[PDB]
């Protein structure tokens, strides 16, 4: 029963690490992208 | 001559299109995916 519960309950180190890595990459991207997105209307006005 | 700035009307064409490419690239990077709506690739979306 202990083995069965462990298998049903525990999580996979590898899968979860991969997901964490992907999400971190996404976070970096999105942060930079938002910065630039704000910058873009700013240069629109600047050129105004 | 005086009345109409056909040249400026022509220039206006160039900003949007490029901006549409800009937005496509921006959203692609933010999502992390090439295909973000079936418009871009229906077949890939389904697959």
UniProtKB/TrEMBL annotation, chain A:
It is found in: Secreted; Bacterial flagellum. It comes from the Bacteria. Flagellin is the subunit protein which polymerizes to form the filaments of bacterial flagella. Belongs to the bacterial flagellin family. This is Flagellin. The lineage of its organism: Bacteria, Pseudomonadati, Pseudomonadota, Gammaproteobacteria, Enterobacterales.
